[PDB]
Amino acid sequence: MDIDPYKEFGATVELLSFLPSDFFPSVRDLLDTASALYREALESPEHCSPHHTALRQAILCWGELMTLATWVGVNLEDPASRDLVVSYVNTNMGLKLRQLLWFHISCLTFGRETVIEYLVSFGVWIRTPPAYRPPNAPILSTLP
Amino acid sequence: MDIDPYKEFGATVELLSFLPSDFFPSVRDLLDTASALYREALESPEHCSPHHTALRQAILCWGELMTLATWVGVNLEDPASRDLVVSYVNTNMGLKLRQLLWFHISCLTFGRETVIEYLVSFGVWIRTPPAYRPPNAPILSTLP
Amino acid sequence: MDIDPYKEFGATVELLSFLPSDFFPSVRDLLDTASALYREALESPEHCSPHHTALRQAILCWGELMTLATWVGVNLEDPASRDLVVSYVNTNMGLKLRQLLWFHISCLTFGRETVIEYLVSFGVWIRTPPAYRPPNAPILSTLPETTVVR
Amino acid sequence: MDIDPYKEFGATVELLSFLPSDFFPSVRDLLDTASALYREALESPEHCSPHHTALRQAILCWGELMTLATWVGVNLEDPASRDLVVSYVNTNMGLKLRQLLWFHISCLTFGRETVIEYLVSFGVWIRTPPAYRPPNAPILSTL
């Protein structure tokens, strides 16, 4: 099928392409954020939110992928092979999981509408040529 | 983070491993079942149900896994090494995805509670001696 | 001290004396059944029922017996006598444990009264010669004989 | 499963680890006490209490372990072996069984809460260095 994991949440894979690949934090950083803020809800027996559901599934997907790649490397012989293997992973699958984790953790921390408006505004900012681009990029905050 | 993908629905990996691995259908068959029965709701922009959410996420996960496995198989030279990697991915991740897709499809089809009762009943059945159990294996049916 | 582990639950050993050994699932099968159906309640800090209590005690007993028998088979110094050791175990203690675990898991799934009636009827059946009894034993199941769930 | 036989009775294997292993009486003594005090209730057709249930099960388990170890010592030839076997038994399985029997008998006799508090206090006593450790170890008593 051709499923978009975001249009169920009011976005698309092309609205999140407004943000470059350089923008998304590491999976370690995002998993730490989750474990810090929504651990007792992700480990809960409740349908607390579609965002929680999707975050659980994404974490399990990252687990499966890491396990596969690690077993591959451990069973593979050459080191450079392993190196560009994990490079391809971090480039293709890690990026998608980063986008997903960011989207969901931000929709939990700030709000779905807030995050979508942030995406629009950051697209404005990053389309704006640098000569006319302010330095104070848009950012998500519960503060002034 | 010690996440169970089934306890927000009322199940557990212990309750799904309570059935033989040789019971869950092929992931191809399950994906076809989904494409036939709920494609219009999985490709929809609606929180139709947590089952739909998890099903979308699981389909995407399987897609990513297959992409990676195909990539590493193409990279590898030996069909022996390819057999190794495909057998591993099947045995572990394909089995997990089989369990997940079966759970969610069967739930959307028959009922979460019917599926859980079916799990326990089929487990007790397959663990019971044949001379002291009903001879026909249990099965789910929408037909009276 | 002349204790019957079932007299408290309304049964006896003379009532389960009729059930054959081929009737009870393996100990691993029964332990898995318990882990899947009542693990949350057996690992709980509550008195859920005497059946839960006795199930916990029986699982602990089986663990102790397993440790003992494995240590023995290991330190025996002849891989030929471990066969007879495990034979004795699976013939006496494994059988008692299967009996007990089955009784409790069943009195939890179905009712205590249901299980006792099943035992009475199964005794009627197994005491009857094959030439005069029906060929298919009575059945205790959460399913109809057709086994189709809707 | 990770069943704790005392969690439903308000204790744990960490609370009874305070008491040493040389503290618990012999299974003979414990069974004599159990008979004398609660025979007509353990031989009874009643869920008189979960303590009674667990005590019955423990007595049966001990009888079973003894049957097994007896059969093993018989079919074994070397007396050194046989003594090593029964020593292993007395050190692991007999120890756990008499922990359980002590817990449940003492509970039936004095109160589950009395016994929990006794465990805590005995921990205090056994952790107290000997220069300040009273010789009068804590003891369960009604009068």
Residue numbers in the entry:
A (entry chain D), B (entry chain C): 1 to 144
C (entry chain B): 1 to 150
D (entry chain A): 1 to 143
Paper lines:
The inner shell is an icosahedral capsid formed by 240 copies of hepatitis B core protein (HBc). The N-terminal domain of HBc is mainly α-helical and assembles into dimers, which form protruding spikes at the capsid surface. Peptides based on the hexapeptide “LLGRMK” block the interaction between capsids and L-HBs and inhibit virion formation. These peptides bind to the tips of the spikes where envelope and capsid are in touch but are distant from the hydrophobic pocket.
Here we revisit two peptides of this family (P1: “MHRSLLGRMKGA”; P2: “GSLLGRMKGA”) and clarify whether mutations in HBc that change the secretion phenotype also impact the binding of these peptides. Therefore, we determined structures for WT-HBc, F97L-HBc, P5T-HBc and L60V-HBc with bound peptides. Model-building showed that peptide-binding splayed the loops at the tips of the spikes apart. Model building of HBc into the maps leaves unaccounted density at the tips of the spikes between the rearranged loops that were attributed to the peptide density. The length of this density could accommodate 5–6 amino acids, which is only a fraction of the P1 and P2 peptides.
